[PDB]
Amino acid sequence: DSLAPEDGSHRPAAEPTPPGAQPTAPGSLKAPDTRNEKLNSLEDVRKGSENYALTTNQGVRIADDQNSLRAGSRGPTLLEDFILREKITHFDHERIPERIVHARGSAAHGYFQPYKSLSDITKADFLSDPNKITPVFVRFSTCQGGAGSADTVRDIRGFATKFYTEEGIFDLVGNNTPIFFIQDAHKFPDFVHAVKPEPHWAIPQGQSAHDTFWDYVSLQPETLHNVMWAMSDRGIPRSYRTMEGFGIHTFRLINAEGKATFVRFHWKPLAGKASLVWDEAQKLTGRDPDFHRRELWEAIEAGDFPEYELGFQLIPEEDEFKFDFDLLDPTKLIPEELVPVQRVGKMVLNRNPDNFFAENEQAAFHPGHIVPGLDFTNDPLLQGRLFSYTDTQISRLGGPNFHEIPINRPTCPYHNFQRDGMHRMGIDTNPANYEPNSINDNWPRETPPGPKRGGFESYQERVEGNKVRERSPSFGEYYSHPRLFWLSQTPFEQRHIVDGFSFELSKVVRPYIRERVVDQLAHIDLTLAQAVAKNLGIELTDDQLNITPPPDVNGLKKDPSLSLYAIPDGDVKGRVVAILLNDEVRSADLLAILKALKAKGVHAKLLYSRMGEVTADDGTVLPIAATFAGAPSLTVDAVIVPCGNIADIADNGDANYYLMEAYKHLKPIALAGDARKFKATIKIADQGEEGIVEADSADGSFMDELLTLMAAHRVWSRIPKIDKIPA
Amino acid sequence: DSLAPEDGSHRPAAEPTPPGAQPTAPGSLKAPDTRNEKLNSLEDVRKGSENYALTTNQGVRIADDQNSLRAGSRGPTLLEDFILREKITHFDHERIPERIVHARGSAAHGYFQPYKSLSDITKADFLSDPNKITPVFVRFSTCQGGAGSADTVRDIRGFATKFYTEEGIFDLVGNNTPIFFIQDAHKFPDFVHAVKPEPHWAIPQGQSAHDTFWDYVSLQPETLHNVMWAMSDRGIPRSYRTMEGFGIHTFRLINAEGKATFVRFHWKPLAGKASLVWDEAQKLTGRDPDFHRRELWEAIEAGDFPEYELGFQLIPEEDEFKFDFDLLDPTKLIPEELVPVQRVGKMVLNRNPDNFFAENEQAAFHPGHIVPGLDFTNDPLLQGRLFSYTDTQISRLGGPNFHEIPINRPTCPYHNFQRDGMHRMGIDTNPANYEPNSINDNWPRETPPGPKRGGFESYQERVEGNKVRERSPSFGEYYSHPRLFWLSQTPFEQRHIVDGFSFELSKVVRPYIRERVVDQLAHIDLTLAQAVAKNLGIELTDDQLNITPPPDVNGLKKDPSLSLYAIPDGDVKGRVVAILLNDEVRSADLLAILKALKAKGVHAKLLYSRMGEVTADDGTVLPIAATFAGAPSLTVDAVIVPCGNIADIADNGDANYYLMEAYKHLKPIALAGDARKFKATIKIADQGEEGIVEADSADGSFMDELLTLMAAHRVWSRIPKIDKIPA
C-alpha cells in the first residue's frame, strides 16, 4: 500500500508547537537539535525505522507479517513457524515488575547548572563551576498507585533527579513535601502496607481514604505532619511544574578542607506553586487519568520547559542541637524563617524521552548514589533506604547489571573488577578480575581523597552508643510541626485541609478509627479538630476541648513559606484557556483574545458542540480542538466566551455545564458582549462579581483583567458562593 | 497494646450483610461455612494470625518491630540487623510482572454443575452427571489497562473460568463479546500494541480513544465487528454479574463413540444484561476506579452470588460449510436465530478469596488446558493462543512450576517424569525420572483413550494443503456481521454506538484517520456513517453515499439476542438505591421504603450532608452511610427522596446535583410528599413524566412503581429530555 497520506499530515512538525496542535512524538524526532551529553551518549542504542525492511530479531527479512504458517489456508498452525514464535514470545515477555512504590511516574531529560561555585562548602564537582552543565533525567510520580493508576489523585508525589556528573551519578530522590510520614525505615513496609490497597480485595487504588491507612495514622502520631500536607491542596498539584521538591533528610556537604555542613535540599518551581481543588482533581482522575503525564510532555513540546531552582538549607555542625526538633528526624521540617533556602542552581527539563518503557520505566534512582563532596547522616529513615533501592532494582530490572541499561549509565568513566551477572553487556579485557594484582599492574587503581577527582572517603563522624533498637527520645514529639503547618495556611487552605480529612474519614468504615483520628487532631489544633468532627457527626469531649496546644517551633507561630498561596508567585506562561465558540464568532473578539494570550505564553483550546470547523463573521475558518464534553473545564485554567451568535450555544446544556463547573472550581471566567447572558446559569449578580470579567467586547482591559486573574491562579473569594450551584 | 476497641466493632460479622454494613474481609473469615473441594484443598497453605507471636520468616520471635538496630539511639544503622534486612528485602521484592493483557481483574471462587448428563455429545467427566459438582475459580477483567487502572472504562472484558475437574483442569478463557478483533494470532502483538498506551509517552491508559487504535482499525476492516460491540453499551457493563460471556472460538466436543461436534461456548448472566451510559462510566472511573471489583466482592458478601448459565451452540460436523461465514473465523458470530444456545449447567460464585495477590494475581488460565471430551479446531487465532499462555506464565510467575502455586493446582492426581525448575515444591520419590523404565515398573503409566478416565487423544481431523502463510479466502468478508449487530440494536442503543464512535474519533488528532474510519462505517450502514460524520464535521462523498450495504447473514436482517435490552431480562436483586435524608424524616415513608426494597433483595444507602446520624420525626436514630458528594448517584441504580423537612436539603447544591446527575444518566427517581419540590431542579412538568415516581407518601403503589422502573434498568424514554440539563 502504503498509506500515510499525500499531504504529510501523519507526521508532526519538528519545532515547538502548542498543546494539541500536532500529534506528540518521541523526543528525538520532535526536537532533534535539543542535545546534552547524556542524550548524545544514548545514540548508540537509538533505533530508527524509515526505509528499513521488517525483520526478525536475528535480522531475517519477513515477507508476510499478516499470517501464521499453516498446513493449508484453513489448516493447523505449524510448530516450525519461527517468525510467529519469536514475535509472540517477545510480546509475551514485555512486562517487568513495577516499582514497589512510585510505580506511576512521568519523566524528562534536561540539564542543571550552578549559579556560582560552591567550593567553600562542598567539593562536589557538579557544583564547582557555573559554566559546568550537568545533564539530568527527572522522574515525577504519585506514590501509592500502580503504573496504570491516575495522575491527579490525592497523594504525596515523588520527585527524583539523576545527575550525570563527571565524578559519578548523583541521584537526589525526594518528594513534594519536606517531611515523610515515619521516622525509622523498619516501619516502611507497615506504613506502605497500610496506605496501599487492602490485602483481601486490593481496593482502593491511588487513595489513602480507607480504614487501614487511618488505623495506622491513628496509632502512630509521628505520621500526622505529612498527613496534614497530604490532606491540604499540596496533595493535588496542578502540574509537576507547579509543586515544590524536597530531599527531606538532612545530608552533609563536605568541602576540600574536610569541613562538614548539614544540608537539606529543595527544589523551587519557577512556574510558581499551584494546586487543583479536590472535586476537580477527583473528576480529572476519571476524565483524564494521564493529565499530569500529558501536561509535562506537552509543556516540553511547546517550549514551556519545566524549570526548578535547587536550594540548600545549611546548618553548621556546631548548630546540630540548637533547634527544638532533631535535625535527623524526617518527620520534622526546618522552617525557612529559621534557616533560609540559599539559591544554588537551575534545572531545566527540555526534552521528552523517545521510548517510555526503555527510558522511564527502566530508570533506577537510589539516594545511596552520592559523590565526593556529599555524605549521609544518621537519619534512621535515610539509613534504611540505603539498603532498599539496590535490592529492589535487581529483581525489578532482572540482574546486577542494571547500570548498563542505557538510561542508567554514567557518562563518566567506570572501571572495576566486578564481572558477569545476568545480561552482562560490558566485555572486560583486563587480564585481572581482582586486586591487588601484579598481572595488570594493579589497574584499575584506587585513588586517594582530595579536593577534586579524588576517591570517596566518608566523613569521620564520631559514633558512641550501645547497640540498641531504640527511637531517640528527641524524636518523640508529634504535634508542633503539624500545628505550625496548620497556622501557616490561608483560611481557604485551612478549609480545604478540613474538607480533605472529612472526606477521607467518611470513607473509613469503622467509626472508632474516625474518632481516634479526631482525638489526634485535638492534640494539634482545636479549631481543626472541631471542624472535622462536625462533618463526621462527632462531638468532642470536655477533655478533648481542654487539650493544651503543642508549643510553637523555636518561637514561630507561622511560616508563610509553608502555604501554597499566601505569598503570590503566579506565572501564566504554559497555562491554557478554553474558548467556547459559536457558529458566527465575532472575529474582532477572537483576534484580540488570541493576541493577548499569545503575548503571555498562554495557550488556547477552541471548543464547540461538534468537531470540524466553524466559520467566523468575517469568513475565518476556525478548527475545533474538542467538544465541550470532550475536553471539560477540568483540563483548563480559565474560560473565555467570545460574542457572536450566542443563541447557538445558549440552549446547549454542555456549554452551560462547562461554565458551572469552571465556576465551582474557582477558575476565572470572561464573557464578552452577548456571552454575558451566561451569567444567569452561574447565578451571580446583575452588577457583576470579582472573578468574572465582562465587557461589550474582548478588548484592551478585558484581556488584562483576565490575565491578572490567571496570575492569581484561582478566585478564592468565590468560595462561599459555589455551594449553591448544582454542579 | 490493646489497640482493638472493647465493643468488638473492628471485626465484621461472619454472616451475609449488605454492602456497606460491615467492613469487608477475607473470604474464609467472612464465610467460614462456604466450602468446596478446591477451597478445602487450599487449607494447607492458609495462614492465620490471631494469638501468634510476630516472627522473622525463619521463625525467630521479634521483640522490637519499631526500630532498626543502631550504634546509639541517634547513631548509624548496623549491617547486622538481620530482622530489618529480611523485612525490607521481602517488601522490596513484592511485585511480579502484570499480565500482558487483562492485567486489571477481579476474581471469586464458586461451583458448577450440569443440568443433565451430556454423554451423548461429550465424554468430558465434568459434564457427565448432574450430581457432579466442579469447583471453579473465575477472574473477570478489563483488557487494555494495567493492574492499577480503572474498572468502568470502555473496553472488552475478559471472563475466565478455571474448572477443577476430576480428569484435569479445564480453563474456558473467554470475553464478554462473541467475536474478537483479529483473525490470525500473528497480528495479536500489532493489535494489542495499537490499543495500548502509545510507546513514546505511554498515554492513554484504559482507552482505545487515541490515534494508533483507530489507525489500525481503519487499515484492518476485520476489526470492525468487535469495534461495533466495544462502541456500544456492551463496552461499559454495569457489573460483571450483568454481562454475557463467550469462548469466541469454535471448539470441538468428542463423545465416547469418537464423534466430533462443533461447539461455541456461552455464559448467560442469570441477573440479566445491563450496562452503564458513557458519561456515567467515565465519571465513575474517577469517583470509584474500583467499582466493578467492589461490586463483585460485596455482592458475594451479601449473598447476591453472581450466577451464570453455561450454554453451547452445537453444529454437526457435516454442517461446517453451511453458513455464509466460516465457522473458524473468530471475527464472525454464530447468530442464535440460526443455531440456538442449548442450556448446559449453572455456575455460582459464592466466595471471595482470602488474599488477592496469592489467589487472584497469581492465577494462571490457559485456553490450551482442555480435558478428554474436548478438542480444538484450526481457528487461526485460537491456534496461536495455544502457544502464548504457557510462555508468558513462566516469566510472569517465575518458572515452570506455576502449577504448584496453590490456586493453580489441580484437585485431581498429577504424576509425571518432569523434574526440577525454579521454586520446585514437589519432592519426587520415584526412582525413575524417564519412561520407558523398568526400575519403577514403568510407573506412572500412559492410559489408553476410553469412555471415562482415559488418556487424551486428539480427534483425527484430516489435514490437506501446502505449507502456506495465507489467510483463507473464506475469512475475507468484514461488514455483514457489523451490519447485523447494528440492525439488531434498539434505537437508543444505536445512538449510544454513534456517540461512542463520535467521542472516540474526536480524540484522534490526525483528521485523516477519522475520515478513513467514517469511510469504513459507510460500508456497514449509511445511517450510522452519516450520524458519526455529522458529529465530526465530516461530509460523506457521493460515492460514499452509494456504497451498497453488505448482505444479510444467512437471510437474517437482525437478531434480538445481540441487543442488551430489546428483550427484557431485568432482575432487581443486588441493585442499590440512594435515599436522600433530611433532618426530620417522616419515618412512615422510611419504613415502607426499606421494607419494600428488602422484600426484593434491593440494597439501600442512607445519605446526608454530613456523617453521623439524623433523627426521624418519631425519634428513630438513622445511621448515615455516606454524604451526597461522598457517594455520588454514579454508584446507585435509583434515587428516592422521602418526605420530612425538605427545606434542610432543598438549598443544598449537592442534593440537587445528585438528582440532576441521576436524571441525566436515566435512573429512576422517586419523590414523596414535599420531596416533589425537587422536580423544578430537573425541569419536569407539573403533571409528571414516565420515570419519575411521585405521590403524597411512600406507600402501596409508590414502591411498586419504583421497583418496576428498576426492573427495566434505565428510563430510555428520557433521552431527548436530558440534553437541556446542565449536568
Ligand code: HEM
Ligand atoms: C524520605 C523518604 C523517602 C522518599 C523521599 C522516597 C522517594 C522515592 C521516590 C521519588 C521513588 C521513585 C524514583 C523513581 O521515580 O523511580 C522511590 C522509590 C522507591 N523507594 Fe523510596 N522514598 C522514601 C522512603 C523510602 C524508604 C524508607 C524505603 C525502604 C526502606 C523506600 C523504598 C523504595 C523502593 C523499594 C523504591 C522502588 C525503587 C525502584 O524500583 O527503582 N523508600 N522512593
Ligand code: HEM
Ligand atoms: C478469542 C480471543 C481471546 C480471548 C477471548 C482472550 C481472553 C483472555 C483473558 C480473559 C485473559 C486473562 C485471564 C486471567 O484472568 O488471568 C487473557 C490473557 C492473555 N492472553 Fe488471551 N485472549 C484472546 C486472544 C489472545 C491471543 C491471540 C493471544 C496471543 C497469541 C493472547 C495472549 C494472552 C496472554 C499472553 C495473556 C496473559 C496470560 C497470563 O499472563 O496468565 N490472547 N486472554
